[PDB]
mmCIF file of C-alpha atoms in Angstrom:
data_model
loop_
_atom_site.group_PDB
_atom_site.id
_atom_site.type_symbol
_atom_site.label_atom_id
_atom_site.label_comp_id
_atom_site.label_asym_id
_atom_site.label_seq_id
_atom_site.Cartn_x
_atom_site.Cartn_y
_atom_site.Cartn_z
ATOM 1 C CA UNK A 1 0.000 0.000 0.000
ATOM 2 C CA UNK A 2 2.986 2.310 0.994
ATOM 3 C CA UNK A 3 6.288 2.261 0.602
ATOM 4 C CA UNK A 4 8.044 4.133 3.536
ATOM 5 C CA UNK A 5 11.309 3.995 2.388
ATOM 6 C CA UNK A 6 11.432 4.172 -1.227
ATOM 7 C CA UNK A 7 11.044 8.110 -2.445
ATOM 8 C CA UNK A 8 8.113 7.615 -4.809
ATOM 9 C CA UNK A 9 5.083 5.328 -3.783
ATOM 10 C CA UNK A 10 2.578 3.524 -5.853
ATOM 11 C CA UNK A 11 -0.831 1.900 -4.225
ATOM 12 C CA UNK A 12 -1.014 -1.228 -5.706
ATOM 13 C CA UNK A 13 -3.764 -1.988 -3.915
ATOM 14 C CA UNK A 14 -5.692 1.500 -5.562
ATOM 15 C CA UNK A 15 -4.799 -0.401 -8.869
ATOM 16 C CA UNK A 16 -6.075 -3.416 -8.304
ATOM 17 C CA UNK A 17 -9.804 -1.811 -7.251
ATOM 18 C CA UNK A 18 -9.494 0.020 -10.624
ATOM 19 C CA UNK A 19 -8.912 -2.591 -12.126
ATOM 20 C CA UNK A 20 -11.856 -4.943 -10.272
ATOM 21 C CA UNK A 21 -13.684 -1.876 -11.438
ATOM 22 C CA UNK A 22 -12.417 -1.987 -15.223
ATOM 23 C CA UNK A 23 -13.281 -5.670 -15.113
ATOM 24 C CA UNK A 24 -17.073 -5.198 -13.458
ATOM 25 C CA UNK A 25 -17.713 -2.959 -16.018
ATOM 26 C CA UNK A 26 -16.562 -5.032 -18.729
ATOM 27 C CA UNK A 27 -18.728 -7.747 -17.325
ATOM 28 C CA UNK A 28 -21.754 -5.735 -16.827
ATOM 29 C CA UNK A 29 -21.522 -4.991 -20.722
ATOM 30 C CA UNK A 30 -21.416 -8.178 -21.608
ATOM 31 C CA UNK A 31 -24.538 -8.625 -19.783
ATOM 32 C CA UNK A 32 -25.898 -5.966 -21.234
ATOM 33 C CA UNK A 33 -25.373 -7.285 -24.928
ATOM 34 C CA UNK A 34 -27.084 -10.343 -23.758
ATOM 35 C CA UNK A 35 -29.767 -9.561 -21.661
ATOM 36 C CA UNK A 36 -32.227 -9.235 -24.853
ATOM 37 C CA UNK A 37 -30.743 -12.556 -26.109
ATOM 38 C CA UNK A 38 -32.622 -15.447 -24.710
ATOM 39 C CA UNK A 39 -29.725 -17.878 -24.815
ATOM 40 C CA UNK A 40 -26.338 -17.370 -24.400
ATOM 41 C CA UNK A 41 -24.112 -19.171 -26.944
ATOM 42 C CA UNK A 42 -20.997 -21.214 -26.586
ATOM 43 C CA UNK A 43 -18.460 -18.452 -27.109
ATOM 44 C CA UNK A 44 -20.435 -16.488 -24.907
ATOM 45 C CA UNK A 45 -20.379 -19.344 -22.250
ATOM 46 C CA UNK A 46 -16.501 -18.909 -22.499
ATOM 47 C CA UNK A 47 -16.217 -15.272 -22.228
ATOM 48 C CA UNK A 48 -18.120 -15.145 -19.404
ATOM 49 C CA UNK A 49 -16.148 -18.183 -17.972
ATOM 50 C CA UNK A 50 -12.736 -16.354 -18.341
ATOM 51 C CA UNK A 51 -13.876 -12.725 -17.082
ATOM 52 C CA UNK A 52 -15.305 -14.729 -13.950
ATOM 53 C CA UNK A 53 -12.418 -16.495 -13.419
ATOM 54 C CA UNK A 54 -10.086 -13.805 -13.151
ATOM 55 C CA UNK A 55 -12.926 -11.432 -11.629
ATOM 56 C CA UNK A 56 -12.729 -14.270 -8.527
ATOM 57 C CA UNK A 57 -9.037 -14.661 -8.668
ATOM 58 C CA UNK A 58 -9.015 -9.993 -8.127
ATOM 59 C CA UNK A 59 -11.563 -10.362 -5.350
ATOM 60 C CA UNK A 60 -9.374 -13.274 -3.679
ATOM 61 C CA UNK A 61 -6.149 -10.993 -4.029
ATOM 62 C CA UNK A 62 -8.221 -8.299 -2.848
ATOM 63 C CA UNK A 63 -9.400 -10.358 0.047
ATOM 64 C CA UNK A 64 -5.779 -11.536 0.823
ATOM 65 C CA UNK A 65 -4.489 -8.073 1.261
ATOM 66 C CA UNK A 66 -8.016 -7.322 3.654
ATOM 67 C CA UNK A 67 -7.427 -10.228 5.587
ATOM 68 C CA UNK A 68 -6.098 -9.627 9.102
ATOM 69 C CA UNK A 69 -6.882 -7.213 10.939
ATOM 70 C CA UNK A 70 -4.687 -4.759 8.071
ATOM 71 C CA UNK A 71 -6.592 -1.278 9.408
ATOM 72 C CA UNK A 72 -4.475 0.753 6.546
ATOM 73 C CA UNK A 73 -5.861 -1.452 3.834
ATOM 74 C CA UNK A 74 -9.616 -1.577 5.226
ATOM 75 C CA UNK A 75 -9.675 2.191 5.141
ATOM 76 C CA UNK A 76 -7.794 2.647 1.845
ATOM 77 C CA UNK A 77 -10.497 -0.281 0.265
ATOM 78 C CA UNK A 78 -13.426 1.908 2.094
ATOM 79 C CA UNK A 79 -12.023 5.117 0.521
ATOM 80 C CA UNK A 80 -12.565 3.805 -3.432
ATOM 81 C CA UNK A 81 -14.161 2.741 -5.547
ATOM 82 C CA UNK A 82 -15.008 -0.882 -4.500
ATOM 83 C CA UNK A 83 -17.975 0.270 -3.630
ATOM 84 C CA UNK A 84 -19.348 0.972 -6.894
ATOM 85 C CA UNK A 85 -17.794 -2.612 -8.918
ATOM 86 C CA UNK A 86 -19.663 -4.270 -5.737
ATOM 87 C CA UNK A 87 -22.785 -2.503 -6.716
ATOM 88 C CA UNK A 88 -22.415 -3.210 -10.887
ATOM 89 C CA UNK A 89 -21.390 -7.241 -9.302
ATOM 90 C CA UNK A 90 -24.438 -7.396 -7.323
ATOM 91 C CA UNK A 91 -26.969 -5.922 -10.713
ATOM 92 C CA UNK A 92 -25.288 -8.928 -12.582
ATOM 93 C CA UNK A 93 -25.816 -10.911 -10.307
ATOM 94 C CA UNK A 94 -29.078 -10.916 -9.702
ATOM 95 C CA UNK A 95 -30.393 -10.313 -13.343
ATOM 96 C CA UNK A 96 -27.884 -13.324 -14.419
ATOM 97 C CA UNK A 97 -29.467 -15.440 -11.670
ATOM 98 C CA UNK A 98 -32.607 -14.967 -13.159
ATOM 99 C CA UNK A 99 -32.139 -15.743 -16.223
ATOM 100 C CA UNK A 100 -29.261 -18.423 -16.342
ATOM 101 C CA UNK A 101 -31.398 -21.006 -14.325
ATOM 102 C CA UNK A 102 -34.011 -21.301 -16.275
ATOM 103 C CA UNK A 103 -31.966 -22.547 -19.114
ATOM 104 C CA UNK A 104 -30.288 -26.059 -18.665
ATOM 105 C CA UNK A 105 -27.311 -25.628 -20.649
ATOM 106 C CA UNK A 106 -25.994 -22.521 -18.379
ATOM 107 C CA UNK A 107 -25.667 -24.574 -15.199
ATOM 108 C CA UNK A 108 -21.852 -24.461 -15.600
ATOM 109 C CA UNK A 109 -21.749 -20.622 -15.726
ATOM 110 C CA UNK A 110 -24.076 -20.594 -13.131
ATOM 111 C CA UNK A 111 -22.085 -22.488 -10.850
ATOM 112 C CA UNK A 112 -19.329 -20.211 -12.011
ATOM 113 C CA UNK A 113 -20.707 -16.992 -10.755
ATOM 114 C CA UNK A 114 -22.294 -18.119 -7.781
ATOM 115 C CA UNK A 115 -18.598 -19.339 -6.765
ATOM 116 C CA UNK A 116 -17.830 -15.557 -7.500
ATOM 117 C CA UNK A 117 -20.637 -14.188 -5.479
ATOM 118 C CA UNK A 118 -19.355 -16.515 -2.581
ATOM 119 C CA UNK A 119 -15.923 -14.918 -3.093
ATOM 120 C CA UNK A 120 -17.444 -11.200 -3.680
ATOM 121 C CA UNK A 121 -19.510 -12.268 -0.466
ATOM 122 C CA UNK A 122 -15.966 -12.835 1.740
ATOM 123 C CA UNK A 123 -14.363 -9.988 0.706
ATOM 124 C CA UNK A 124 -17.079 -8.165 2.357
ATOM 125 C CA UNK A 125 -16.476 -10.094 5.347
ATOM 126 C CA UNK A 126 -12.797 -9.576 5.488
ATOM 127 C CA UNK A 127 -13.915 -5.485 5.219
ATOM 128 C CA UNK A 128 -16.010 -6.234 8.340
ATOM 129 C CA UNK A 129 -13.357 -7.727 10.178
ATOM 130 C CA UNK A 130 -12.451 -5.949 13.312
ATOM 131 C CA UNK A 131 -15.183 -3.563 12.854
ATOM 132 C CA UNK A 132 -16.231 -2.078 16.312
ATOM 133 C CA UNK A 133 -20.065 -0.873 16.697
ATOM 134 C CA UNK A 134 -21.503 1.908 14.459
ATOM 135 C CA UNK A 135 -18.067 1.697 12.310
ATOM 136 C CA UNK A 136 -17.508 3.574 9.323
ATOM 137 C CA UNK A 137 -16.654 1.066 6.975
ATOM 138 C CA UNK A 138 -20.080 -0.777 7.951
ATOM 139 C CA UNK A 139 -21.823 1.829 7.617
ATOM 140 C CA UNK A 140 -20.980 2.382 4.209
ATOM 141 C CA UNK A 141 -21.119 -1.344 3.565
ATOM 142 C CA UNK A 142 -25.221 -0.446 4.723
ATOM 143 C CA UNK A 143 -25.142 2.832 2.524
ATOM 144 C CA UNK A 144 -24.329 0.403 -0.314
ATOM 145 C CA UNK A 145 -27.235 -2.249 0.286
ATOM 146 C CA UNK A 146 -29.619 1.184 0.371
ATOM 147 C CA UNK A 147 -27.742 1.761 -3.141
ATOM 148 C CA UNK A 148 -28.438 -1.734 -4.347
ATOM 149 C CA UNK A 149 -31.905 -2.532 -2.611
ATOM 150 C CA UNK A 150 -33.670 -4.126 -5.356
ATOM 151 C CA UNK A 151 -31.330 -6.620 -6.655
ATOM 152 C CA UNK A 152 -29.892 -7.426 -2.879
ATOM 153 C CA UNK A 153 -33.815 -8.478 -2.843
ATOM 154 C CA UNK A 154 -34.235 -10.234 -5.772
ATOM 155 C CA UNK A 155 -30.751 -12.331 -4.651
ATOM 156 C CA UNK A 156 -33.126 -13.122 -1.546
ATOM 157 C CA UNK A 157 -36.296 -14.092 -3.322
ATOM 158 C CA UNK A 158 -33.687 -16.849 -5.247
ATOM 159 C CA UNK A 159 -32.048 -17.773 -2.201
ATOM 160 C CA UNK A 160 -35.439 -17.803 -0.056
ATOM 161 C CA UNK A 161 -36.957 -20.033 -2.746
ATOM 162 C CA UNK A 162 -34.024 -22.542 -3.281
ATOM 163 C CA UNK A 163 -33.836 -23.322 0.223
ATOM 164 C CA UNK A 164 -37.750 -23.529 0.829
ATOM 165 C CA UNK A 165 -37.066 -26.181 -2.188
ATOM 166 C CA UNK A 166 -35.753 -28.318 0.005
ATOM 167 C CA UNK A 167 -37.916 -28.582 2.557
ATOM 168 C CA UNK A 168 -40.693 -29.090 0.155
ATOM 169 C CA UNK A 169 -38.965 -32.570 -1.106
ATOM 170 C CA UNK A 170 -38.564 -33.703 2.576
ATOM 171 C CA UNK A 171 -42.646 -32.497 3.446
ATOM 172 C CA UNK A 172 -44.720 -35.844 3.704
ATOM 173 C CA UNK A 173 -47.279 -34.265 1.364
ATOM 174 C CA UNK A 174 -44.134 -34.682 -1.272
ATOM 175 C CA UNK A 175 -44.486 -38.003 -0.275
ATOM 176 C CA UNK A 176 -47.633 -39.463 -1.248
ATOM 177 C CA UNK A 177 -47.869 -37.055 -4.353
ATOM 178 C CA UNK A 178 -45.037 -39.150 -5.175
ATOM 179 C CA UNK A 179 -45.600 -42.580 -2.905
ATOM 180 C CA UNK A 180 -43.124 -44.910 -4.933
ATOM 181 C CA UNK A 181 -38.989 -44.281 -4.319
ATOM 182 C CA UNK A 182 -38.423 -43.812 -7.743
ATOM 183 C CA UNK A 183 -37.965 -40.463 -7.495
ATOM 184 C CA UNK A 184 -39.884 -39.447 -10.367
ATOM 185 C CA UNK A 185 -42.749 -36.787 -9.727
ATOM 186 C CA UNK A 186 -45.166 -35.006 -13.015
ATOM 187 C CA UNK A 187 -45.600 -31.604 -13.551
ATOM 188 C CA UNK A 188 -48.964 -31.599 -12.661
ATOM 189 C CA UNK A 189 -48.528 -33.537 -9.515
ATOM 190 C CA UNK A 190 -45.636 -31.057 -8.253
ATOM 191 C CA UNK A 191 -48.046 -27.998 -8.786
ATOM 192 C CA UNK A 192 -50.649 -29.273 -6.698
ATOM 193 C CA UNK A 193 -47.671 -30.002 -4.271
ATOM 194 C CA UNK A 194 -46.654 -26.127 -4.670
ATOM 195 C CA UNK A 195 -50.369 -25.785 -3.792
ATOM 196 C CA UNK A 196 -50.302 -27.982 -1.087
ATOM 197 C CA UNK A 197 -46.954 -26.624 0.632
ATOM 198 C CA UNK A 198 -49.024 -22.883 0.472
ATOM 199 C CA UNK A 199 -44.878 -21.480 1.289
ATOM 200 C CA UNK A 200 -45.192 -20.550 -2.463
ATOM 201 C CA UNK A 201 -46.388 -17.933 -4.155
ATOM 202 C CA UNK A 202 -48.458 -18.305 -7.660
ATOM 203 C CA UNK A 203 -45.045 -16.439 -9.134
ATOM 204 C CA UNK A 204 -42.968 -18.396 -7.181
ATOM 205 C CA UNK A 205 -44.682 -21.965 -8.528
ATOM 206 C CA UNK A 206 -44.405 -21.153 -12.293
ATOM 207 C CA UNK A 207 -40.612 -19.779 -11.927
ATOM 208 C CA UNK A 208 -39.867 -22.758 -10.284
ATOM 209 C CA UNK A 209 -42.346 -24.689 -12.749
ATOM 210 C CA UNK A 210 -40.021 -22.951 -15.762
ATOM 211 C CA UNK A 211 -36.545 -23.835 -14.258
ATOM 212 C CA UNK A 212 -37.569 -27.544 -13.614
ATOM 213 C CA UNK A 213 -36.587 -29.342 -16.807
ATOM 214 C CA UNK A 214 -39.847 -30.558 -17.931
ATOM 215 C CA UNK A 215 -39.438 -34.581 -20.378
ATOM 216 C CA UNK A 216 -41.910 -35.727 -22.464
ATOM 217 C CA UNK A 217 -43.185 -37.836 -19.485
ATOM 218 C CA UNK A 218 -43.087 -34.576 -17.811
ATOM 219 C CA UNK A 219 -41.921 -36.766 -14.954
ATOM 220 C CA UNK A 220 -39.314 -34.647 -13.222
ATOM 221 C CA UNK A 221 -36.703 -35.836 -10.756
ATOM 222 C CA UNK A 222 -36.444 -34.036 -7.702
ATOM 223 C CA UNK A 223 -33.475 -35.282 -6.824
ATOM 224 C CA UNK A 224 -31.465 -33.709 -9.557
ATOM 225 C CA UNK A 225 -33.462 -30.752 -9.207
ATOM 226 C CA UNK A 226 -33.095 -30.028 -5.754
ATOM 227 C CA UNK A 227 -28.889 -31.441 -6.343
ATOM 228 C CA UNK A 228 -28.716 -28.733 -8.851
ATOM 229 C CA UNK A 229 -30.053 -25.937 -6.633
ATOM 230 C CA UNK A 230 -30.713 -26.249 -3.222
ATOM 231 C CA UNK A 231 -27.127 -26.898 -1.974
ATOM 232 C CA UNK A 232 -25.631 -24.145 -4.215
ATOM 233 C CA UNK A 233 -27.887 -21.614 -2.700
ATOM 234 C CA UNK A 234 -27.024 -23.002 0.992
ATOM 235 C CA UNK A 235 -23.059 -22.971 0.235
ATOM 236 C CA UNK A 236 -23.128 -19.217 -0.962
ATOM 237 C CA UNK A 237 -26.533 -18.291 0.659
ATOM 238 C CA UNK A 238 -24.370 -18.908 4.088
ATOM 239 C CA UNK A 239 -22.083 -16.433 3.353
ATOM 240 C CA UNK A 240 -24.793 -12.817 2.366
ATOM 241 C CA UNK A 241 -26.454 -14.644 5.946
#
Protein backbone atom coordinates (compact mmCIF):
# COMPACT_ATOMS: atom_id res chain seq x y z
CA UNK A 1 0.00 0.00 0.00
CA UNK A 2 2.99 2.31 0.99
CA UNK A 3 6.29 2.26 0.60
CA UNK A 4 8.04 4.13 3.54
CA UNK A 5 11.31 4.00 2.39
CA UNK A 6 11.43 4.17 -1.23
CA UNK A 7 11.04 8.11 -2.45
CA UNK A 8 8.11 7.62 -4.81
CA UNK A 9 5.08 5.33 -3.78
CA UNK A 10 2.58 3.52 -5.85
CA UNK A 11 -0.83 1.90 -4.22
CA UNK A 12 -1.01 -1.23 -5.71
CA UNK A 13 -3.76 -1.99 -3.92
CA UNK A 14 -5.69 1.50 -5.56
CA UNK A 15 -4.80 -0.40 -8.87
CA UNK A 16 -6.07 -3.42 -8.30
CA UNK A 17 -9.80 -1.81 -7.25
CA UNK A 18 -9.49 0.02 -10.62
CA UNK A 19 -8.91 -2.59 -12.13
CA UNK A 20 -11.86 -4.94 -10.27
CA UNK A 21 -13.68 -1.88 -11.44
CA UNK A 22 -12.42 -1.99 -15.22
CA UNK A 23 -13.28 -5.67 -15.11
CA UNK A 24 -17.07 -5.20 -13.46
CA UNK A 25 -17.71 -2.96 -16.02
CA UNK A 26 -16.56 -5.03 -18.73
CA UNK A 27 -18.73 -7.75 -17.33
CA UNK A 28 -21.75 -5.74 -16.83
CA UNK A 29 -21.52 -4.99 -20.72
CA UNK A 30 -21.42 -8.18 -21.61
CA UNK A 31 -24.54 -8.63 -19.78
CA UNK A 32 -25.90 -5.97 -21.23
CA UNK A 33 -25.37 -7.29 -24.93
CA UNK A 34 -27.08 -10.34 -23.76
CA UNK A 35 -29.77 -9.56 -21.66
CA UNK A 36 -32.23 -9.23 -24.85
CA UNK A 37 -30.74 -12.56 -26.11
CA UNK A 38 -32.62 -15.45 -24.71
CA UNK A 39 -29.73 -17.88 -24.82
CA UNK A 40 -26.34 -17.37 -24.40
CA UNK A 41 -24.11 -19.17 -26.94
CA UNK A 42 -21.00 -21.21 -26.59
CA UNK A 43 -18.46 -18.45 -27.11
CA UNK A 44 -20.43 -16.49 -24.91
CA UNK A 45 -20.38 -19.34 -22.25
CA UNK A 46 -16.50 -18.91 -22.50
CA UNK A 47 -16.22 -15.27 -22.23
CA UNK A 48 -18.12 -15.15 -19.40
CA UNK A 49 -16.15 -18.18 -17.97
CA UNK A 50 -12.74 -16.35 -18.34
CA UNK A 51 -13.88 -12.73 -17.08
CA UNK A 52 -15.31 -14.73 -13.95
CA UNK A 53 -12.42 -16.50 -13.42
CA UNK A 54 -10.09 -13.81 -13.15
CA UNK A 55 -12.93 -11.43 -11.63
CA UNK A 56 -12.73 -14.27 -8.53
CA UNK A 57 -9.04 -14.66 -8.67
CA UNK A 58 -9.01 -9.99 -8.13
CA UNK A 59 -11.56 -10.36 -5.35
CA UNK A 60 -9.37 -13.27 -3.68
CA UNK A 61 -6.15 -10.99 -4.03
CA UNK A 62 -8.22 -8.30 -2.85
CA UNK A 63 -9.40 -10.36 0.05
CA UNK A 64 -5.78 -11.54 0.82
CA UNK A 65 -4.49 -8.07 1.26
CA UNK A 66 -8.02 -7.32 3.65
CA UNK A 67 -7.43 -10.23 5.59
CA UNK A 68 -6.10 -9.63 9.10
CA UNK A 69 -6.88 -7.21 10.94
CA UNK A 70 -4.69 -4.76 8.07
CA UNK A 71 -6.59 -1.28 9.41
CA UNK A 72 -4.48 0.75 6.55
CA UNK A 73 -5.86 -1.45 3.83
CA UNK A 74 -9.62 -1.58 5.23
CA UNK A 75 -9.67 2.19 5.14
CA UNK A 76 -7.79 2.65 1.85
CA UNK A 77 -10.50 -0.28 0.26
CA UNK A 78 -13.43 1.91 2.09
CA UNK A 79 -12.02 5.12 0.52
CA UNK A 80 -12.57 3.81 -3.43
CA UNK A 81 -14.16 2.74 -5.55
CA UNK A 82 -15.01 -0.88 -4.50
CA UNK A 83 -17.98 0.27 -3.63
CA UNK A 84 -19.35 0.97 -6.89
CA UNK A 85 -17.79 -2.61 -8.92
CA UNK A 86 -19.66 -4.27 -5.74
CA UNK A 87 -22.78 -2.50 -6.72
CA UNK A 88 -22.41 -3.21 -10.89
CA UNK A 89 -21.39 -7.24 -9.30
CA UNK A 90 -24.44 -7.40 -7.32
CA UNK A 91 -26.97 -5.92 -10.71
CA UNK A 92 -25.29 -8.93 -12.58
CA UNK A 93 -25.82 -10.91 -10.31
CA UNK A 94 -29.08 -10.92 -9.70
CA UNK A 95 -30.39 -10.31 -13.34
CA UNK A 96 -27.88 -13.32 -14.42
CA UNK A 97 -29.47 -15.44 -11.67
CA UNK A 98 -32.61 -14.97 -13.16
CA UNK A 99 -32.14 -15.74 -16.22
CA UNK A 100 -29.26 -18.42 -16.34
CA UNK A 101 -31.40 -21.01 -14.33
CA UNK A 102 -34.01 -21.30 -16.27
CA UNK A 103 -31.97 -22.55 -19.11
CA UNK A 104 -30.29 -26.06 -18.67
CA UNK A 105 -27.31 -25.63 -20.65
CA UNK A 106 -25.99 -22.52 -18.38
CA UNK A 107 -25.67 -24.57 -15.20
CA UNK A 108 -21.85 -24.46 -15.60
CA UNK A 109 -21.75 -20.62 -15.73
CA UNK A 110 -24.08 -20.59 -13.13
CA UNK A 111 -22.09 -22.49 -10.85
CA UNK A 112 -19.33 -20.21 -12.01
CA UNK A 113 -20.71 -16.99 -10.76
CA UNK A 114 -22.29 -18.12 -7.78
CA UNK A 115 -18.60 -19.34 -6.76
CA UNK A 116 -17.83 -15.56 -7.50
CA UNK A 117 -20.64 -14.19 -5.48
CA UNK A 118 -19.35 -16.52 -2.58
CA UNK A 119 -15.92 -14.92 -3.09
CA UNK A 120 -17.44 -11.20 -3.68
CA UNK A 121 -19.51 -12.27 -0.47
CA UNK A 122 -15.97 -12.84 1.74
CA UNK A 123 -14.36 -9.99 0.71
CA UNK A 124 -17.08 -8.17 2.36
CA UNK A 125 -16.48 -10.09 5.35
CA UNK A 126 -12.80 -9.58 5.49
CA UNK A 127 -13.92 -5.48 5.22
CA UNK A 128 -16.01 -6.23 8.34
CA UNK A 129 -13.36 -7.73 10.18
CA UNK A 130 -12.45 -5.95 13.31
CA UNK A 131 -15.18 -3.56 12.85
CA UNK A 132 -16.23 -2.08 16.31
CA UNK A 133 -20.06 -0.87 16.70
CA UNK A 134 -21.50 1.91 14.46
CA UNK A 135 -18.07 1.70 12.31
CA UNK A 136 -17.51 3.57 9.32
CA UNK A 137 -16.65 1.07 6.97
CA UNK A 138 -20.08 -0.78 7.95
CA UNK A 139 -21.82 1.83 7.62
CA UNK A 140 -20.98 2.38 4.21
CA UNK A 141 -21.12 -1.34 3.56
CA UNK A 142 -25.22 -0.45 4.72
CA UNK A 143 -25.14 2.83 2.52
CA UNK A 144 -24.33 0.40 -0.31
CA UNK A 145 -27.23 -2.25 0.29
CA UNK A 146 -29.62 1.18 0.37
CA UNK A 147 -27.74 1.76 -3.14
CA UNK A 148 -28.44 -1.73 -4.35
CA UNK A 149 -31.90 -2.53 -2.61
CA UNK A 150 -33.67 -4.13 -5.36
CA UNK A 151 -31.33 -6.62 -6.65
CA UNK A 152 -29.89 -7.43 -2.88
CA UNK A 153 -33.82 -8.48 -2.84
CA UNK A 154 -34.23 -10.23 -5.77
CA UNK A 155 -30.75 -12.33 -4.65
CA UNK A 156 -33.13 -13.12 -1.55
CA UNK A 157 -36.30 -14.09 -3.32
CA UNK A 158 -33.69 -16.85 -5.25
CA UNK A 159 -32.05 -17.77 -2.20
CA UNK A 160 -35.44 -17.80 -0.06
CA UNK A 161 -36.96 -20.03 -2.75
CA UNK A 162 -34.02 -22.54 -3.28
CA UNK A 163 -33.84 -23.32 0.22
CA UNK A 164 -37.75 -23.53 0.83
CA UNK A 165 -37.07 -26.18 -2.19
CA UNK A 166 -35.75 -28.32 0.01
CA UNK A 167 -37.92 -28.58 2.56
CA UNK A 168 -40.69 -29.09 0.15
CA UNK A 169 -38.96 -32.57 -1.11
CA UNK A 170 -38.56 -33.70 2.58
CA UNK A 171 -42.65 -32.50 3.45
CA UNK A 172 -44.72 -35.84 3.70
CA UNK A 173 -47.28 -34.27 1.36
CA UNK A 174 -44.13 -34.68 -1.27
CA UNK A 175 -44.49 -38.00 -0.28
CA UNK A 176 -47.63 -39.46 -1.25
CA UNK A 177 -47.87 -37.06 -4.35
CA UNK A 178 -45.04 -39.15 -5.18
CA UNK A 179 -45.60 -42.58 -2.90
CA UNK A 180 -43.12 -44.91 -4.93
CA UNK A 181 -38.99 -44.28 -4.32
CA UNK A 182 -38.42 -43.81 -7.74
CA UNK A 183 -37.97 -40.46 -7.50
CA UNK A 184 -39.88 -39.45 -10.37
CA UNK A 185 -42.75 -36.79 -9.73
CA UNK A 186 -45.17 -35.01 -13.01
CA UNK A 187 -45.60 -31.60 -13.55
CA UNK A 188 -48.96 -31.60 -12.66
CA UNK A 189 -48.53 -33.54 -9.52
CA UNK A 190 -45.64 -31.06 -8.25
CA UNK A 191 -48.05 -28.00 -8.79
CA UNK A 192 -50.65 -29.27 -6.70
CA UNK A 193 -47.67 -30.00 -4.27
CA UNK A 194 -46.65 -26.13 -4.67
CA UNK A 195 -50.37 -25.78 -3.79
CA UNK A 196 -50.30 -27.98 -1.09
CA UNK A 197 -46.95 -26.62 0.63
CA UNK A 198 -49.02 -22.88 0.47
CA UNK A 199 -44.88 -21.48 1.29
CA UNK A 200 -45.19 -20.55 -2.46
CA UNK A 201 -46.39 -17.93 -4.16
CA UNK A 202 -48.46 -18.30 -7.66
CA UNK A 203 -45.04 -16.44 -9.13
CA UNK A 204 -42.97 -18.40 -7.18
CA UNK A 205 -44.68 -21.96 -8.53
CA UNK A 206 -44.40 -21.15 -12.29
CA UNK A 207 -40.61 -19.78 -11.93
CA UNK A 208 -39.87 -22.76 -10.28
CA UNK A 209 -42.35 -24.69 -12.75
CA UNK A 210 -40.02 -22.95 -15.76
CA UNK A 211 -36.54 -23.83 -14.26
CA UNK A 212 -37.57 -27.54 -13.61
CA UNK A 213 -36.59 -29.34 -16.81
CA UNK A 214 -39.85 -30.56 -17.93
CA UNK A 215 -39.44 -34.58 -20.38
CA UNK A 216 -41.91 -35.73 -22.46
CA UNK A 217 -43.19 -37.84 -19.48
CA UNK A 218 -43.09 -34.58 -17.81
CA UNK A 219 -41.92 -36.77 -14.95
CA UNK A 220 -39.31 -34.65 -13.22
CA UNK A 221 -36.70 -35.84 -10.76
CA UNK A 222 -36.44 -34.04 -7.70
CA UNK A 223 -33.48 -35.28 -6.82
CA UNK A 224 -31.47 -33.71 -9.56
CA UNK A 225 -33.46 -30.75 -9.21
CA UNK A 226 -33.09 -30.03 -5.75
CA UNK A 227 -28.89 -31.44 -6.34
CA UNK A 228 -28.72 -28.73 -8.85
CA UNK A 229 -30.05 -25.94 -6.63
CA UNK A 230 -30.71 -26.25 -3.22
CA UNK A 231 -27.13 -26.90 -1.97
CA UNK A 232 -25.63 -24.14 -4.22
CA UNK A 233 -27.89 -21.61 -2.70
CA UNK A 234 -27.02 -23.00 0.99
CA UNK A 235 -23.06 -22.97 0.23
CA UNK A 236 -23.13 -19.22 -0.96
CA UNK A 237 -26.53 -18.29 0.66
CA UNK A 238 -24.37 -18.91 4.09
CA UNK A 239 -22.08 -16.43 3.35
CA UNK A 240 -24.79 -12.82 2.37
CA UNK A 241 -26.45 -14.64 5.95
Amino acid sequence: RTQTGNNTTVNIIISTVDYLLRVQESISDFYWYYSGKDVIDEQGQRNFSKAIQVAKQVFNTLTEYIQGPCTGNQQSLAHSRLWDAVVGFLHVFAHMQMKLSQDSSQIELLKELMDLQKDMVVMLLSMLEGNVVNGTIGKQMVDMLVESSNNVEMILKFFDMFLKLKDLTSSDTFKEYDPDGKGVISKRDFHKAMESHKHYTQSETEFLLSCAETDENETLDYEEFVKRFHEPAKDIGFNVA
